[PDB]
Design a protein around this ligand. Sequence first.
Ligand SMILES: C/C(=C\[C@H](C)CCCCC(=O)O)[C@@H]1O[C@@H]2C=C[C@@H]1OC(=O)\C=C/C=C\C=C\[C@H]1O[C@@H]3C[C@H]1O[C@@H](/C=C/C[C@H]1O[C@H](C[C@H](O)[C@H]1C)[C@@H](O)[C@@H](O)/C=C/CC/C=C/C2)[C@@H]3C
Ligand SMILES: [Zn+2]
Lengths: 99, 190, 1111, 147, 53, 176
Amino acid sequence: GAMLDVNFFDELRIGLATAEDIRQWSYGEVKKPETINYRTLKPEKDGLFCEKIFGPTRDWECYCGKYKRVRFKGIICERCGVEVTRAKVRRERMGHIEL
Amino acid sequence: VQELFEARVPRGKAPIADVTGRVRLEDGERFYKITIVPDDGGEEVVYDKISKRQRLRVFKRVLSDGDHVEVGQQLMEGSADPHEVLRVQGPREVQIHLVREVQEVYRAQGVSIHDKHIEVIVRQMLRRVTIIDSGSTEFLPGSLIDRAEFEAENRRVVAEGGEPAAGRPVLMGITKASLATDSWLSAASF
Amino acid sequence: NSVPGAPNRVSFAKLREPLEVPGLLDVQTDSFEWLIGSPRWRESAAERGDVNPVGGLEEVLYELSPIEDFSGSMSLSFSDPRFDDVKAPVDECKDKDMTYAAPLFVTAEFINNNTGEIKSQTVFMGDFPMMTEKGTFIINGTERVVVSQLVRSPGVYFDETIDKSTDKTLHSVKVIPSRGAWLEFDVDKRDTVGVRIDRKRRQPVTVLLKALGWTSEQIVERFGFSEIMRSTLEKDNTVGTDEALLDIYRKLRPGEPPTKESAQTLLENLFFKEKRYDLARVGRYKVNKKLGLHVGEPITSSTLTEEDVVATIEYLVRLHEGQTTMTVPGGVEVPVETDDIDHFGNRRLRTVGELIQNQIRVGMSRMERVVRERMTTQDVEAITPQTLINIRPVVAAIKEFFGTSQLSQFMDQNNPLSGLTHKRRLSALGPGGLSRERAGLEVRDVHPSHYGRMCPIETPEGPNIGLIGSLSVYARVNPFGFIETPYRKVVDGVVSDEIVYLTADEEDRHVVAQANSPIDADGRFVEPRVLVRRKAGEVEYVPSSEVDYMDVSPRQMVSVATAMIPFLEHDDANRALMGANMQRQAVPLVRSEAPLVGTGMELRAAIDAGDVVVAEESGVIEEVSADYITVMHDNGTRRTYRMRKFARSNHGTCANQCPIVDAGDRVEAGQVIADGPCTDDGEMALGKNLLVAIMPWEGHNYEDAIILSNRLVEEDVLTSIHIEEHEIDARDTKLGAEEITRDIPNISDEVLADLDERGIVRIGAEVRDGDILVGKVTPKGETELTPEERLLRAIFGEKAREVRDTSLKVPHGESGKVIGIRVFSREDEDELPAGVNELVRVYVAQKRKISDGDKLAGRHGNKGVIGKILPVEDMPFLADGTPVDIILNTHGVPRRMNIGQILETHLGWCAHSGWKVDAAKGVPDWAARLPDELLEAQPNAIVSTPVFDGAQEAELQGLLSCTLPNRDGDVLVDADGKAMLFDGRSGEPFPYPVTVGYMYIMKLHHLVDDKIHARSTGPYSMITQQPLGGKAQFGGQRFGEMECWAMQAYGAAYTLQELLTIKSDDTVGRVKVYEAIVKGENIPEPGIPESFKVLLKELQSLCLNVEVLSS
Amino acid sequence: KRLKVVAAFQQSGNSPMGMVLDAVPVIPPELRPMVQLDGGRFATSDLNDLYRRVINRNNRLKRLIDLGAPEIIVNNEKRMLQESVDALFDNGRRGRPVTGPGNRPLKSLSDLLKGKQGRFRQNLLGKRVDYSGRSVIVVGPQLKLHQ
Amino acid sequence: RVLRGSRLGAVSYETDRNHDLAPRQIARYRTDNGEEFEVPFADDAEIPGTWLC
Amino acid sequence: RQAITRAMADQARTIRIPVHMVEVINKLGRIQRELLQDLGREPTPEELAKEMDITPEKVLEIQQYAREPISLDQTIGDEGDSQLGDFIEDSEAVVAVDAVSFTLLQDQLQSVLDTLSEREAGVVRLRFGLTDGQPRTLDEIGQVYGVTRERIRQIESKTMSKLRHPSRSQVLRDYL
Ligand SMILES: C/C(=C\[C@H](C)CCCCC(=O)O)[C@@H]1O[C@@H]2C=C[C@@H]1OC(=O)\C=C/C=C\C=C\[C@H]1O[C@@H]3C[C@H]1O[C@@H](/C=C/C[C@H]1O[C@H](C[C@H](O)[C@H]1C)[C@@H](O)[C@@H](O)/C=C/CC/C=C/C2)[C@@H]3C
Ligand SMILES: [Zn+2]
């Protein structure tokens, strides 16, 4: 396996994914049919855009706004729950639905 | 050109013989019943539905009854399907026929293509072989695998399990052979 | 001739044609005033019978009326539509971007059956757009033109398709109606029929026959002479008429338990009730003509009949048997034959009235459904037609037609020929028509019925050949939708003057003579063996007594834009196609000189195009100016004609209008009073007249390139205006509202000197590429500050300036003066979309010169870009110092078969220099048929050789031998048409004489400034990370698939890796590449593209464990 | 023809359990963005409707099971859940496609791959590049051959 | 002519430093079915009792 | 009917809108339909606010809230190969010249601060957080150097006067 992908490749093996691998890729169970707030235009909690699940919309900032510096990096806020990191991790983080 | 590279059956499919001997040329009612008398003691191969709109092949004069024809001689006029010339005249002669038939098209416009540009494509057609006897090594009848892979395991499986597979050369078109590749990622794009 | 203020354009024609050209926009105006129901249309239809004339609106409202509920206890009527005036005139609507509408008013009527009432109101039906006097509608400010459309006529059809496995001709019939359900009576591979009522599954005809109410005995005494129907009679296999109804119900409807009551009522509700099956009036007339049922009665009862069905089956089985005729019981006999779809007897023309009528009908269906719904839910003794009626689906259907449809297109105006050819344009695509991918190859070709109804030349030449055509010149549309064509009738060989308009069918009934036939000036031909056209499109030599119809003239089979090519009969069809297509892409120049040699179609095609102000009534001129002409009529009243100066067209070109009348002149009705964009003194003028040599010159005119002199750049000969329109709007946001002002943050006061005190620029300021046009600043909000920006602000003391600049800047590669400023504001109470307070539009204009790269063309498909603009000294001058203007190339002439340009060149030199033949010993022999007052002509005199009856070779050669000299006695051009040039560059004479003359070339709308386009780094896309595409943005070129094949075939792997990684998608790589180029280091190694990771995330998202492995 | 797939499942280290599914993954929201334009006209990405239908029917099924209902309601809800997941993975496969406003079928998750508009056919069709440009061409009869 | 879009997210530009960061603890949370998860909380911060895993 | 209308208020929209806003939006739509059928034209928003006993800016807010989103999977141009999402400029992207401008500005800032002394550059960097991203105060600077806060403030004002020179600061002036 390789999750950083620094330009050295030999094989691209496809395979049928199971329930354990599906709930092991995921960063949280999405459990509400909400996308965005209609008034303040921010992502809802536990929705299809939730910053707790997928990550922060703004670079190096939590949702409640407590941490805003690069010095706080790799940590998770105690209140809002968003891991402070870059805003390109919303491109890559996946979630799962429990049927 | 496209019906030659796809190895489809043609429209004006003139038949071919299978063995030497004089012909039992018979022009029936509204369609011909061409039978061939073999040179040696053999069966007389009958060709059923040869319509009168097809024409007699002219060679060396016009065709006559009792003409001692060759092995893979084209019977009527038209274009033989290359599947039948493979099964009759082996793998060498079909390469001679497939190049010369395509190169007859491009000469009508005075277009010059060297034959090695066509011999690359014809090489990709006859890479695989059919399986009629599975032997004892992970095989199934009707499968078309590579010639270089069918023989290489048969180099080893003749010892400790010596039931060799029975292979035969097959001719498949470009659209068929492009799908059966070893990389799923390339064949996904097709 | 027959136009009062006409320039004297002397003609070369020999034939005296009887019939003048009709109104060129009647194909629009007659159809729209048929739809309205104008009194002019009322008397026009009363001119030829039609004792009950009805408009489109009253026809729709009569086929809707009455509306009834499920009980029949209440009914709604509809009657008497009437219009108001238009709410706002034309120029005000085009200014304020309102549509050009007028209200409808319809007297509805509600009748209560139980207790007895009427309730008569005057229901406002909705606003309704109206056609102007040029055949154009106005939608939201723009100018839209509804294109006509060819469809297949409803009726019966017949064909056979032989299968070679069967070797039998298998017939078929498709009775295709309008708005109905299909049904067929095929013949299978066996000797049995196949009846596919609406397309579930095949069936025998005995099932439908016994289901219709027929016995085997009536089957035998009606169908009595075919083994096919006798074998299906013995193979009927289902006994029982009610059993036949049950079998029909069980076959047509799946998954439903059959019943004997509703099945018999279903079949009458499917094919004989005139509310869910309506073959139109045209279709009923076509069927009654084909089978001969109704021979003298008016066409009513738009549903089918069982007599027509059994006559169809009898016709099919007798065509399968093979006959020449058949009479039906009770009707006249008819010939038995198959049918052709591409014939113009089966291909009618759904014009603009038919299209608007169909949209109004499909709106009124939903309005009727809403009425039928709320007829029950409402309470009685309280409701009224004001309460029952919802006009919003009707007005939504109209507004959804005029915008956002295929047939409603922008008016193609960059010269008045282009508007005239965007109207009268016949297509086969669009709704109700065949798709482009589903277009058969046979429908693209020219059927022999197209002679006089559609031009076989003018059509687009992309992947749309033959799908789009234009009308002919003398053509005309029937009330039914078929295309008429005039013909001179001829009795006993004496050609009369009775002009009879034929359609395709009765054209095929007769035999048709030739236009240019030698008539003895008494009505009769001089030879018995005349060219003629037979029934099936054959060409014969008939004796001159069977001829019963002649053409009116030549150029009948040609379009308008193709009839403006001199010497068309010498050009090939492909190059004439290219010439007629490129004749309407010409741009309006600033001087607009009339052509020397032309046809006689310029004057009519200009004064019918509507871009020329015509004097409405005869009178005397009171006052001219640059802006208006006021005439004084014969009785007191005055009228002022407001010109349009520098109005923007739909494609950026200019639309000036200058007068041509003086102060004290006297005008007549129909006389031209003001020029248009591309007009000179009344007639069309799309280009200029230029001296031309045909030598190949130093490889600069290699492979259709053109070189020019510098005189055309110096003297503004090929220069044109171009007007562009910019727009910005100050919306409202969450954080506040954007404001239009001068206080732009972080911008120097040096570039803020142009614009005035309120933000916008002032009229007359010349702008470069990238200057500020409208000052606009938006609120932005609060962000954190980087320490370096904080320290620079602490050092310099500049404030935060929390508002963000998003101003309006002129895009790349544009310049020019500023003509006009139009500003709409919320405080001045105009209509605007929601949340927009200020809309401001700036009009920038520039004066584009000619340049190398720009595209020029003649009138014969001889296009080509400008290769070089030489100075005036090194250009091969004539024998007396005159330099030539353009230099064409020889090798492009003979292999394209368009020596019409050579004949135009010779006749242009003759028409420039002026000739005078010598009638001392009488007229010379070559000029015997040459008409009078062409024996001598002044220099710079115009002429007109018409399309198919023009100059001849002997006439042109003898006229070219006598071509009187210029200033000194020096005939510069000898008898072959050539001259002894001098090389302007070296100095020696060219050793052989070169063809010279005066051509007519035009400047096209493919200028370089709209095409040159570059990008280093600009805007990127959002979903994918590729650079954006298009000249409107910065835009990058598509490095496609075959280019990747070429880069693989070279072996250059590194360039392909770069082009697919660090120039498109490597998001962390692009900034490093730009940094490495700026700092001057080596370009770093490329990474994984974004598209591959997107593919990986999708495959992981689709429950597929895709894994990358190394070792 | 059955021993093909039976030996396919036997020979590899796979298992046939994954053809029934118990947890559905969610593609990241940057690949299905809800971007606003100038003026607040929002632009969704047409997979959010499918995900919303799956979430709604799953939550309703959970509420019905916790409530306790007769078998007809629970079987109808489970059938609707199954059809929602089917429309999410491939719209238009089983019967009529789930359509949006104006009878337009929604671009499902499999429609990003197949067809002329898929990821594969585009990625073989080629990308757009920086550092490029075009213009009309004219003849250059004074240049040398490498110019 | 051109239409622009914007996701509602600010984009900064800084240096991804790996050396000097704010230090942080790690706490283990336990679910019902024996699952363990480790959450890096900040130092000057209250450790909440329950936490959605 | 209560449960069906409640579910239609909840789940029939892409972005979620609460129940009272759905009720006033449907009221606004019904009143606009009635005034369209009565007046014959589109009503003025001030007349709608007069009818609904509210303010016209509230009418505009409700009309802003009522706008449903458009989809990104249709064909904008004539050819269907051009989808809608391939004409959207990502305005929140990296301009790729400001980034290298920021790096060059950081390098010039480092050189300019190196043209001062050690203590001056130290107190300016610790004042503005130039090295870690944390703006300390004069108490922390006087703690790390062992002097009063007022001496640190005097040194800071002296250095700010030193940097405010044309010779020392034209190269930084050109960066804004
Ligand atoms: C492909 C097509 C129209 C093309 C856009 C233009 C014609 C293509 C043929 C050609 O290359 O010459 C078909 O048009 C109709 C229905 C289906 C098709 O439309 C289609 O499927 C494609 C578009 C249909 C409606 C578009 C409406 C609006 O899009 C803009 C504004 C509105 O109309 C467009 C402008 C149309 C006028 C054109 O006119 C052409 C030249 C330019 O291409 C344009 C100025 C001239 O050739 C003009 O004289 C001929 C017009 C064709 C008459 C209508 C035929 C059927 C402009 C791009
Ligand atoms: Zn937070």
